Each structure stands twice: as C-alpha cells, then as structure tokens.
Amino acid sequence: SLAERYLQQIAQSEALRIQQELNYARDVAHNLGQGLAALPSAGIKDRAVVDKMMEYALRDNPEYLSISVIFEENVFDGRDAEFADQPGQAPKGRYAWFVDRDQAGNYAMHPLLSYLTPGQGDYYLLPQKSQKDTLIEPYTYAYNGVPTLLTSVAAPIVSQGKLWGVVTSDISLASLQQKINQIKPWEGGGYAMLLSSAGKVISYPDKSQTSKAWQGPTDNFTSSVVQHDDAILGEQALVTWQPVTIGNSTEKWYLGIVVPVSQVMAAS
Amino acid sequence: SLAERYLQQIAQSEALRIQQELNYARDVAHNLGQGLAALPSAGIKDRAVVDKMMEYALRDNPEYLSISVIFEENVFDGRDAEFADQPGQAPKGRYAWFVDRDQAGNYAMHPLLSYLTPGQGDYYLLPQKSQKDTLIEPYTYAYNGVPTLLTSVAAPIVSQGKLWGVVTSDISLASLQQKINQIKPWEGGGYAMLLSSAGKVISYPDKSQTSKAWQGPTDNFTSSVVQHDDAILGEQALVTWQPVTIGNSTEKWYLGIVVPVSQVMAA
C-alpha cells in the first residue's frame, strides 16, 4: 500500500537522522583511537599526552558526559606494572582513564575502576572481545555525585591487525531523548520511540519507562506496519520499526514511529 | 499529494545516506585536527608525530586518496623559518603536507606545493577564510603521475577560539559516483544526481557531464516536485531536490531524485 510505504519511508528518514548522531559519537571515539595508536609508533610514550588528546575531544563535544580510553595491557608504554598498585590508578596499572567536566567546567581525569568487571565494565569488555563497534546497553554512572543514565558508543582501536584497546563516547540518555521527543512523524503529531538491542527503552514519551524492558507491540521489531491501541495517543495507531546501526556493528537499535490511524487513513 | 510527499520522503532518505558518507569524511578530518591541536598543549612539537597520525588516518580509510594537513603559520612549532626555501618543503616552510599511497601501496609524505595558489589551493584557501567545513568544488590532482578528479572534504581546525589550520579528506569523484549511481529511487528504477553548491555536476549518470555546469531545469533547488522530459529515462519524469550538508557548513550540495511519471501515476 502507498500509505504504508510512505510511513515506512518516514521511519527510514528518522532512523537515518538518529543514526547520524550516534555515528558521529562513534567517529569521535574511533578517530581519537587511531591517533592514540599512532603515538607509540612516533615514539611518544607519555600518558599525559593521551590525557590531553582526550581532553580536546571532550572539549569539542560539550554535550557528551565523558570520553573513556582503555589501552590493552602494556601496549602503550609497557609500564603498567609501575602504576599497578599506586594510589588513584586503574586496576593493574592499565591506561584505563576517562575525562569529564567538574562543577566549574574544568576537565578532570579519573581512573576506570570498573573496566575489568562484568556488567559495569561492558563498555570495555564487550567490544574488546568482539572487536566490533558497539552501542552499549543503558547503565548508570555518578558524575560529580549525580547518578546519570547513559549509554556508551564504544569503538575498538584496530590497526594493522593489532588491537590497541577501546575508546568510548559517553552519552546521556536524556540528551538522546531530547532529540527523539522532537520527532513529530505525521503532520505535527504522532511520536517516535527508541529501543536498545536487548529491547531496553532508550526514549519513550513516558520517561518513567527509561532503561526498562519494553513489554509492548513489536513482532521482532518488524518493518511491516501494524495497528495497535496506543496509550500515548489514546487511539488506534500505526507502528513501524527501522534499525539503527553504527560503524561496523552487527547488532542494532530500533527506532519506532507511531502515528494515529485517524490522520493517516483519513488523509488517504 | 500523498504520492508527492512519499517521493519527497524518498529524496530525504537518499540524501541522508549520502550525507552520512560525506560527514564520515568530514569527521575523519575534523577529529584528526582536534588531536593535532592538542599536541603543542602536551609539549609535542615534532613534525614527525603529525606525519604518523596522518598516516594512521589514511591507513584506516583505504578508499581515500589522501589526507592533507595545513597548519597556520608557526602555530605548531614556531620553526617554519628553518624549513623555508628548502627543496622538498612547502612554501614558506609551513607545515603543509599530505600523505598518499604508492603504486606499491606504502605510504609517502608530500608537501602541499599548491596551498597558497588560488584555484588549485582552494582546499586550503576557501575554508581558511570562512573557517567553515566545506565540500570543495571538484578539481584535479596528479596522484602518482595520474590526473584524478577528486573532491576534498575540508575541516578547519578551531579550538578555544584559535584557528590552527585546515585538515582535508581527499576523495575521488569516482567513489562518490559509484554510490550515487546505485541509488534506484523507485521500484528499483529512476536515478539520482548530485550537484555542487555552484551547480557543477558531481554525479550524473552520463559521466561526461562530471564537473561541468548543469544547464538543466532546476526549480530553485526546490523540494517541490516538478515534471520534465528526461533523456536518461527517455520519458516524462518527476524531479525533487534535497540538500546535503556537512558539519557547520553554511553551503550545501543537492541530491536530485528522478523517477518516471508513468510509474508514479500507477499509485
């Protein structure tokens, strides 16, 4: 049907827009990583140089929560054992650090205490093993004493067959929701929703649903158009899903478009 | 009008896909540039470090022709005078270099001899003046002795108020054409076109129009659908235009979608 193809095409356009936002974040992390891997080749072995490069990347991205960098064991300078148990360092002396902004807006380095533990540390552990770009399931981190729901857009660092580590761009769920809730897919109405790979809510007009498992209408996040009793719109709605993918990832997120049957069938 | 709106939506999706590809190149150049500007701040003043980061950016982008970096005068190391008027260097001893691949496939650094000359050097001169990301009008450079049509995706380096220079990702027009000509906007049929800001043909299914001016019926590059006799399709066709923009560029390219009227009149 012509209406349903048009609806499918709207969903495609909107998934491409949000895909551009997430790829931008992947690119910041991926391109920062390629430059960091060039440093040992050029004879630069000073971890303060990595700190400054990470700082300038965060500086250029004022809405990001932080940038995180994890090199593989010893590959940067060979000195993980010297840092191993010193105060304020990361587990086993690894170059595993992130940069964020303080309450005054100046830039601070903090060690990645979580990077070896399953769950919290998946921003490192999952892409380290797959060597694939990865949109990480939503989780929580306290920045300046404020619990914050976020995702990480993680990019393995691969060059000349060698894994150098992982770089991530750390993105608040709120900032994503700010873009998704602007989407008005049909004559200034309807709404858009965004779901993770595991089907966790990234953005839904009922913010109380954030980070929770979706328990609703999808038939395996189909591209087909399906009619549902929608609680946000309070009427019969048409729903279609489109995938969102970054870099070389094989997994995906799902953008959903929801429009009222009344305004669609009636426009005909 | 529902058919019109769908056609417009198709153009918007195809435009977004091309725009993602051009923005990937903008990002390569922009993000390298931010890393390079960090280096003096960290005490690195060795031009060989810049060489290596450029090489690693090109290595990660085997399809690109080269990556070019032009620093502003003396901003990296203050030593331009020590490199000035030596053969093998760029004009005035500037850090102005590109990296490319040999016929053997290994990486070589070459000076940007043209960075101050109007026309050939616009990849530097135009973004240095506007300080905006810029899709450079298509031009020619002899890589390894072979004239090649390319565009440069140019990203001025700005950090904490200061212009540090310009980085560019240099892309062959052939690779862009190879992507535009796979676009089949309708049922597997029709085609897509790409005009530069100046109306030069970036991509048109007749490649002999490449880089030439477009003396065709564009309606102020309107989203509005317009009907025209089309030579490529050989029938009445519907045309619609959508902008394509990178970074903070104020200028844009235009993707045109062209589909036969007979197949749109179907539904």
Author numbering:
A (entry chain A): 18 to 285
B (entry chain B): 18 to 284
Original authors' sentences:
Chemoeffectors are sensed by chemoreceptors that in turn stimulate chemosensory pathways that modulate the activity of the flagellar motor. The dCache domain is the predominant extracellular LBD in bacterial signal transduction systems, and it is present in about 15% of all chemoreceptors. To identify the molecular determinants for acetylcholine recognition, we report high-resolution structures of PctD-LBD (with bound acetylcholine and choline) and PacA-LBD (with bound betaine).
Betaine bound most tightly (KD = 7.5 μM), followed by l-carnitine and choline with KD values of 20 μM and 113 μM, respectively. We crystalized the PacA-LBD and solved its 3D structure in complex with betaine to a resolution of 1.9 Å. A well-defined electron density was observed for betaine bound to PacA-LBD. The orientation of betaine corresponded to that of acetylcholine in PctD-LBD, which was the opposite of the orientation of choline. However, the amino acids that coordinate the acetylcholine tail in PctD-LBD (Ala168, Met169, Asp171, and Ser172) are not conserved in PacA-LBD. However, comparison of the three-dimensional structures of ligand-bound PctD-LBD and PacA-LBD identified the amino acids uniquely involved in acetylcholine recognition.
